[PDB]
Amino acid sequence: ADVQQKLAELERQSGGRLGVALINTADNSQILYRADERFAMCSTSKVMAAAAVLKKSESEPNLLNQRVEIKKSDLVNYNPIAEKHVNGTMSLAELSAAALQYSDNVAMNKLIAHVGGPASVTAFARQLGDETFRLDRTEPTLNTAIPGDPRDTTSPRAMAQTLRNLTLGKALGDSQRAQLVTWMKGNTTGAASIQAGLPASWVVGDKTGSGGYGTTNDIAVIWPKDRAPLILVTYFTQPQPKAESRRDVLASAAKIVTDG
Numbered sequence: 001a002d003v004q005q006k007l008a009e010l011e012r013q014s015g016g017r018l019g020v021a022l023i024n025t026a027d028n029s030q031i032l033y034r035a036d037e038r039f040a041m042c043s044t045s046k047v048m049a050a051a052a053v054l055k056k057s058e059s060e061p062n063l064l065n066q067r068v069e070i071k072k073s074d075l076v077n078y079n080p081i082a083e084k085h086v087n088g089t090m091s092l093a094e095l096s097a098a099a100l101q102y103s104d105n106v107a108m109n110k111l112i113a114h115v116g117g118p119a120s121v122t123a124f125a126r127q128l129g130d131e132t133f134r135l136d137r138t139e140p141t142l143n144t145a146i147p148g149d150p151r152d153t154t155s156p157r158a159m160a161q162t163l164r165n166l167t168l169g170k171a172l173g174d175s176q177r178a179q180l181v182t183w184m185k186g187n188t189t190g191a192a193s194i195q196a197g198l199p200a201s202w203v204v205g206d207k208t209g210s211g212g213y214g215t216t217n218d219i220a221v222i223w224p225k226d227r228a229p230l231i232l233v234t235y236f237t238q239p240q241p242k243a244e245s246r247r248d249v250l251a252s253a254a255k256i257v258t259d260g
């Protein structure tokens, strides 16, 4: 009864709205906090786009090797990897890595493009039993996280279940699941979010997200030493539109729900 008491003060002291879903695969217990409220996904949505492509590749053998042109026109606000390939190409594999590991926003757009637009990414979620996920826009506007808006949202519960299906279950074939885990395990943007609330010794594969209204999110699969893995989704959003990011809130939330 404490664990939920502690998350609620974190929420107060942090002055925001906090969503949490933990899945302990050791006994399939869950910890839920507003786990059925909608939250602007922001970049944590890149995991579903990369997954949708991977799924496709299972019936398009070398889909991951198809070349995709990067045009100067394509660049948006955050383009750390694509910017190096303008008037060149990137493979779908390279765009998946870049989207997942550096949060490259051109890469996402390319992923969205090659599955059929945001509605079909959503359609892929439905294929997975996720009836909550909805991708409605492209980069960069899908990060507005305006309150009460439902575009580009999901619920902590639905995305932890989905992320377990994708990284540990059988949503993807063995090869594609392994690729997603290696990509996520290779994220460079997560060191201050879920990760910072765990023992430094644990292995983490995570995808951060951030957007307007101070919205700071992270979604992770976690392999502690000598334990069964966890799936943890932390979503955090704030009232004022200009609020600064609070990755530390995700770290505290992870700390609270992993204590014990």
Ligand SMILES: *C(=O)[C@H](NC(=O)[C@@H](N)c1ccccc1)[C@H]1N[C@@H](C(=O)O)C(C)(C)S1
Residues within 6 Å of the ligand: 042, 043, 044, 077, 078, 102, 103, 105, 140, 143, 189, 208, 209, 210, 211
């Ligand atoms: C997903 O929201 C998020 N960021 C973006 O989509 C960009 N608009 C952006 C990224 C980085 C800096 C500035 C803007 C992922 N990018 C991660 C990062 O590199 O720090 C993140 C933690 C900002 S999330």
